Amino acid sequence: QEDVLAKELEDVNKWGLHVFRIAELSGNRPLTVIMHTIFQERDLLKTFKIPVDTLITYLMTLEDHYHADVAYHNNIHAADVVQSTHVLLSTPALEAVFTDLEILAAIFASAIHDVDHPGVSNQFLINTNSELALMYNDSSVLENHHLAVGFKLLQEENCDIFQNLTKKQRQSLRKMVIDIVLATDMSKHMNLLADLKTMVETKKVTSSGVLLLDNYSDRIQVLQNMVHCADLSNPTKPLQLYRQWTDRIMEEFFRQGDRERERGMEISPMCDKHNASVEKSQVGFIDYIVHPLWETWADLVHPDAQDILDTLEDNREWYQSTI
Amino acid sequence: QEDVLAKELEDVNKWGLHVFRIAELSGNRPLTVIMHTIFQERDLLKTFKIPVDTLITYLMTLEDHYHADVAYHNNIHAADVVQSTHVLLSTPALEAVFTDLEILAAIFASAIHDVDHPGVSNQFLINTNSELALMYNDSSVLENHHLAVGFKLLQEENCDIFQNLTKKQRQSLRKMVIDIVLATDMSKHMNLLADLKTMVETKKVLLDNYSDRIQVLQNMVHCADLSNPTKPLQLYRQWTDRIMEEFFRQGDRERERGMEISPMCDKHNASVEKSQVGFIDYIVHPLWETWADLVHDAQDILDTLEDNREWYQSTI
């Protein structure tokens, strides 16, 4: 079983990794083994003098703080977003654009970006007067919480994977991770996409053909959109992966809708199991959210993401054909 | 003693209220007695069916969560900002332009806007890796905490002063209070002033959209927060003595930690008088001159600020 796990992890640079199989083969430790594999692949332990036992201890504590009883926003989602960000960071149009610290920030941000997610949305938490929404003044409630937990766990015993960064490196990494995870709030999607479109329309490329990003605002904008694309990458994956993700988010959504219905609340979009059309909802999700975002990312890195976009478009056609 | 307190509160509608006297005669309850007076002055208990016992219970609990061992950011500052907003709200040029709910929000936001303040700055909390900064991801750390405490206290026994607001009214009030208190973060001052300037350049004599009206309310409570240099000099000097005690204690902690000492916090290299002229020239007067242009009613306030700047300059 360890042999089969190791073979599957050889695919870590590939879009469409068998992440659900890795979750099973690793004993429900997909986030730990995928993060460890990616850190070895990118030589991040050596670069940042991360002790291996510290990395594994932190990753296993981080993974523990995802909820195994939440169908979608769990450690497998986190592992998937990590691995998807890792692939997007390797795209030819971004070669040697980002520093090792920025790479570390994007991957760490992906790993923590949904930690301790309770399986209900920000609006649900706001409208039910939850303790989380009271703490965070109704503003990026979940995303602030994910950051606070992900950083606080670094202070547990033998968990500070950043123990050997300089003070300036720690300060820069913390700021970038915050900026990235806050951009995963879906209420920011339209403004994030609008800004990404502006960047594509005005983009500059170097003599080597890679993207030119010469200020923090542009650099962090690209990393924010990269992790947001990774977060919204399920419809761009091979259909058997996409369908499993859809089964899971519909389970989580319907359970939130059941709580809304029981409380006499208006049921959130896609959350009413009695008035649901999963197929129509996926075509709409792709048409109005996922394809506008990914076609813009594809333009930013053209032609690198053409196969990903093609898969998205094929999956949209497949779902539409079932209507 | 109770009779003298009642007579001091007769000036609740005037700039320059004797708030330190009121703090003394109240048994250190200036926030509770001044909020109660202003609520009764504005008929807010009957209007929002606020049980008077519930108002008092909430106010006393809120006041208890201001730190009595913090020289400036305490319940007397809260009471002063409440009363200053109350005076700015009754500006003739703003007559009947805000609803009773928005008035409630501006006054409530002022009352809670610094609650549970530890007497050190956001940058201090960030650079010391505090629990507060870990909770709030280095972003408006104190202001987010002030809001969270002020609202959480409504859930204590017999403290829900908004119990008879409709569900929509509570949602709207909550949003406006958050928008206002988050705007008291001093790192937002320049952007807030820039937008107030844009509003003055386009002023109609009248704010039609919520964006503009919340912007005025944000700037109004920010002016009230930065109103000490516009008060009668005897009050302003007391406020300056208090904030310099708080600043010097923070700078002592920064020095001992080996941190950069924040502006005005190094007692061994301080000039309080030069600091005040700089504070007025670069922050307070540009803000209040813009406000006075918006309400062109604030002339007596701006005059006092300019008088006080002239005096502090003369002490150099």
Ligand SMILES: CC(C)=CCc1cc(-c2coc3cc(O)cc(O)c3c2=O)cc(O)c1O
């Ligand atoms: C359109 C509205 C109201 C909200 C956007 C929104 C969408 C998702 C989401 C994520 O991953 C999916 C994966 C699938 O495979 C299928 C899916 O449908 C989804 C989703 O829907 C999660 C949100 O938290 C959220 O806000």
Ligand SMILES: CC(C)=CCc1cc(-c2coc3cc(O)cc(O)c3c2=O)cc(O)c1O
């Ligand atoms: C210049 C920097 C670094 C920060 C500006 C800044 C200034 C104050 C402040 C408030 O009320 C005062 C009252 C007085 O009577 C005299 C005073 O000097 C002050 C002040 O200075 C409070 C801040 O929270 C803050 O950030």
Ligand SMILES: [Mg+2]
């Ligand atoms: Mg999320």
Ligand SMILES: [Mg+2]
């Ligand atoms: Mg404050």
Ligand SMILES: [Zn+2]
């Ligand atoms: Zn996510």
Ligand SMILES: [Zn+2]
């Ligand atoms: Zn204040």
